[PDB]
Amino acid sequence: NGYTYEDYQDTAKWLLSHTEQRPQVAVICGSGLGGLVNKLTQAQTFDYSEIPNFPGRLVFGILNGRACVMMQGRFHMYEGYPFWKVTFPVRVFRLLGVETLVVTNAAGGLNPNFEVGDIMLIRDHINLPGFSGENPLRGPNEERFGVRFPAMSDAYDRDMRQKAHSTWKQMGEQRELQEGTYVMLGGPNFETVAECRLLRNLGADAVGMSTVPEVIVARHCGLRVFGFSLITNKVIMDYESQGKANHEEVLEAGKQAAQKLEQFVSLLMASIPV
Amino acid sequence: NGYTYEDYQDTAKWLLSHTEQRPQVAVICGSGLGGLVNKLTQAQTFDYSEIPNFPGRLVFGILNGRACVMMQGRFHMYEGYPFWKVTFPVRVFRLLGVETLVVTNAAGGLNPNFEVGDIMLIRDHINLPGFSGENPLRGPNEERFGVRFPAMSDAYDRDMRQKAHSTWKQMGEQRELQEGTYVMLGGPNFETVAECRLLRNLGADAVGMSTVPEVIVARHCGLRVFGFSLITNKVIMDYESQGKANHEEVLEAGKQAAQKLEQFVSLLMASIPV
Amino acid sequence: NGYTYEDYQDTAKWLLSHTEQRPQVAVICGSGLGGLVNKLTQAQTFDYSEIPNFPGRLVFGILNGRACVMMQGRFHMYEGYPFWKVTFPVRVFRLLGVETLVVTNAAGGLNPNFEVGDIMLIRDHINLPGFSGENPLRGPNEERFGVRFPAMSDAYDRDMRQKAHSTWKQMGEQRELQEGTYVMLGGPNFETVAECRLLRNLGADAVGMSTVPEVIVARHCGLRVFGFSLITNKVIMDYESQGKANHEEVLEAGKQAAQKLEQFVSLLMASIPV
Ligand SMILES: Nc1nc2c(CCCCC(F)(F)P(=O)(O)O)c[nH]c2c(=O)[nH]1
Ligand SMILES: Nc1nc2c(CCCCC(F)(F)P(=O)(O)O)c[nH]c2c(=O)[nH]1
Ligand SMILES: Nc1nc2c(CCCCC(F)(F)P(=O)(O)O)c[nH]c2c(=O)[nH]1
Ligand SMILES: [Mg+2]
Ligand SMILES: [Mg+2]
Ligand SMILES: [Mg+2]
């Protein structure tokens, strides 16, 4: 990790001086949710380029009455960021006073029961880069954030998932809310058929390229975490299919679901403990 | 990636000035195929050491009436190369005007139906280093080569595999041509029993230490790809076996198969699209 | 790898000139075995800071009559060491004249038949970082240590494991000695439920964060290898459990087991070929 403890403190102190807002919730907007900052009131925006130590914009504002800090644009391993840069904002959030992190992403559906446009609550994850030691916590532990060996078995808050199921029901959507396991791999290529079959056999329901390292750092520093995937495509599972994953369809799925995603997150603000 | 687009251009230009050959086919010769360059007519040879930006020798020549460029010797992750070095030649090939890449390798047989000396057409792959983000495409995307998120589900050209089956028949070899999934891992050690069992349970038929990153880059830049593995050993699947994988047996299998592999590739030239 | 053959040689020379002891056994003490040096007679201690090229202390002394060199403190990937630093001592031991390496660790129990406090003999391993090329042998091969492609299928000496079972039975312990496959991942976080389930389905019995690199380098240089894990916790396998892995209970389990682990290793010395 290239950052010192004091880097995170300096960045938090800088933000705290430059805004009077004091959010308890941070939201990292993945695909389909880039427009969520447009639902904020009393919005104050900082370009990442103007914030000390930041590797896009960070927006402080109020979402459905709740003070939030939002990343419009996140960082990815596939773009060449190390995980200690990808996750820098999460520790800054903790030092700002945030207590809950909401994460979202786009993902391919491995579970054959999913459909394009589904929302999948993340109940759990599989961190494939972590199996080989690629991990934002690699290196000396900063005890001022958390412990050397943090547990991940309770990462995705149970109460929030129950409340998300309730909220969804009250929104009266025809399509049910999905829930399952998100597997992170590095990307940026999409998977072969053989890779898709094995990922599904690992127990995964959705595959993507982000989120997990953010969650690990969030849990290490004691944040409550809730997340979901937008299912943008059903991954190709056989050789006979003329289907082929492509950015175009992912972008189009994101566009079609944007309103539903934003609405759902906005409504969920009410369920986050104060 | 330490190379700029202009680095690839410089190397392509250097080669195009040093030879008047204009190949449509590139062959990366894996174990057992090192002698293929000796079958070329009107061969012109360049040591890797002399070629600008190259991390063996590169040979331009005619094989069975088709103009080829051929890597005698390739680069491996286990020798300490990053994938952006391993795959440098593939993008150069595209800039030379190559349209089809033939790749080969040696591999251990995970499928118990394989025998030493079998050729396995590669129908698909599993990229284990890519699960952790070790990927030649990591970093900012070069759009002059291809898209940010390239698909891999159709990587191994279906027509070529059909024509390879037909070509093998024409050869009257008594051993059938195999076809299956190659899994790449870093190496250089051979697998434990527990590792072999889990790799077979992932759906892999053969295990090796190369090829996949070159295929990813090839597909990203639009090349047609055909590949195969020489099965040099049946991997050890139980603790009771007195068998043990060893380089000597791998070298011996390559020697015994060399003529058949060279003949197969030569004959396959007639089936590569023009 | 930052070390040349001469660096290892220099380090070995230096140790050989600074002690008269000529150990044939090396012990890398994992969790629970830190106190084993206290059972050494005629002990001479070198701080790692004293030894040329070393990335804790190295203790030469006599264990149950048998000359040993023991690492009190090993190096871990999760603390930011590359595997070429983690495994540096193993090659030094070979150049000292060591013929047998004993390794130990703490691990989480994936096999539901295990209980906290169990000792699991390592019959085999799964090297997940090695699947992505994170391997202490990556780079140019040094033939003076071993071959380019060393086999791992016979890594854990069969005779030593049989003798360990006999020793345990003669100790009269009522809990049986376990035996199985250890899977290494990077850490330092503990696993999610989904990860635990998939690792069990890979065929692993215990999961930890060390050892495997040391074993690969040991086998590459021809050392006999024996190892075990102390099972410090039963990994969480379902979402209904209120359990949660924690360092406090791992430390406590090691503390409780220490006197027995030290006794077991001490008695096992008699079973090493002389
Ligand atoms: N590996 C993989 N990833 C995806 C994705 C996610 C593509 C990248 C998403 C993103 F930009 F990283 P995020 O920030 O997670 O929304 C969609 N469909 C698939 C898919 O089929 N496979
Ligand atoms: N992982 C693994 N690799 C192999 C191999 C391939 C050895 C290396 C081949 C090579 F040099 F990398 P290539 O360039 O792919 O021909 C033969 N048998 C086995 C085997 O049993 N396991
Ligand atoms: N991945 C993983 N590791 C562990 C451990 C090992 C913790 C670290 C041990 C160590 F310090 F690295 P060692 O040198 O191997 O004793 C205990 N329980 C679990 C567990 O449940 N999961
Ligand atoms: Mg600073
Ligand atoms: Mg359903
Ligand atoms: Mg057959």
Q: How far apart are CA A215 and CA C97, in angstroms?
A: 47
Does ligand 3 lie within 6 Å of residue C265's CB atom? Answer: no
The Cα of C131 is separated from the nearest Cα of chain B by a number of Å equal to 5
Chain A residues with beta carbon closer than 8 angstroms to that of B126: 192, 194-195, 198
Contact A233, A245 (CB under 8 A): yes
Contact A178, A119 (CB under 8 A): yes
Closest-approach residue (CA) in chain B for C185: B132
Domain that holds residue C50: 1-274
B2 in reach of chain A (CB within 8 A): no
Nearest C-alpha neighbor of C199 from the set C132, C119, C110, C129? C110
Is A107 annotated to bind a ligand? Reply is no
CA-CA distances (angstroms) from residue A53 to A58, A86, A212, A251, C91? 13, 12, 22, 30, 41
Ligand 5 (single-atom ion) residues, CB below 5 Å: A 113
Nearest C-alpha neighbor of C67 from the set C99, C29, C30? C99
Give the number of other Cβ atoms within 10 Å of residue C41's Cβ. Answer: 9
* Sequence-separated (6 or more) residues with CB below 8 Å from residue A230: A30, A31, A32, A33, A104, A105, A106, A107, A117, A118, A119, A253, A254, A257, A261
Closest-approach residue (CA) in chain A for C81: A139
Is A186 close to B147, i.e. CB distance below 8 A?
no
Chain C residues with beta carbon closer than 8 angstroms to that of A135: 78, 186-189
In a 3-state reduction of DSSP, which class is residue B4? coil
**Interface residue of A105, A125, A195, A252 to substitute, partner B, most B CBs within 10 Å:** A195
What ligand has the least distance to the C-alpha of A185?
1
Phi, psi of C108 (to 5 degrees): -80, 140
Chain C residues with beta carbon closer than 8 angstroms to that of A137: 78, 188-189
Q: Residue A188, preceding bond cis, omega within 30 degrees?
A: yes
Q: Where are the beta strands (DSSP E) in A40-118?
A: 41-47, 57-63, 66-72, 100-109
Kindly state the greatest CA–CA separation across chain B: 59
Nearest C-alpha neighbor of C104 from the set C213, C236, C211? C211
Contact A268, A167 (CB under 8 A): yes
In a 3-state reduction of DSSP, which class is residue C60? strand
In a 3-state reduction of DSSP, which class is residue B47? strand
Tell me which long-range contacts C38-41 makes (C-beta under 8 A, separation of at least 24).
Answer: C38/C262, C39/C63, C39/C262, C39/C266, C40/C68, C40/C70
List the single residue in B131, B132, B189 with the smallest CB-CB distance to C137.
Answer: B189
Q: How far apart are CA A271 and CA A159, in angstroms?
A: 9
The CATH number linked to A90 is 3.40.50.1580
* Sequence-separated (6 or more) residues with CB below 8 Å from residue C150: B188, B189, B190, C137, C216, C219, C220
Domain tally for chain C?
1
Quote the tokens at residue A246: 């492509």
Q: How far apart are CA C64 and CA C274, in angstroms?
A: 13
Residue type, B86: V
Q: Where are the beta strands (DSSP E) in A4-47?
A: 25-29, 41-47
Q: How far apart are CA B242 and CA C170, in angstroms?
A: 30
Quote the tokens at residue B85: 């070095």
Contact B100, B244 (CB under 8 A): no
Give the burial class of B249: count Cβ atoms within 10 A of its Cβ; 0-12 exposed, 13-18 middle, 19 or more buried. Answer: middle
CB proximity under 8 Å: B 57-96 to A? none
Chain C residues with beta carbon closer than 8 angstroms to that of B233: none
Q: Where are the beta strands (DSSP E) in chain C?
A: 25-29, 41-47, 57-63, 66-72, 100-109, 119-127, 178-184, 206-208, 224-234
Return the axis-axis angle of helices B88-96 and B212-220, rounded to nearest 10°.
40
Q: How far apart are CA A270 and CA A94, in angstroms?
A: 20
User: Could you tell which of A28, A209, A252 is best to mutate to test the pocket of ligand 1, judged by most ligand atoms within 8 Å of the CB?
Assistant: A209
Distance B12 CA to ligand 1 centre (A): 33
List the single residue in A123, A126, A137 with the smallest CB-CB distance to C189.
Answer: A137
Does ligand 2 lie within 6 Å of residue B106's CB atom? Answer: yes
In a 3-state reduction of DSSP, which class is residue C30? coil
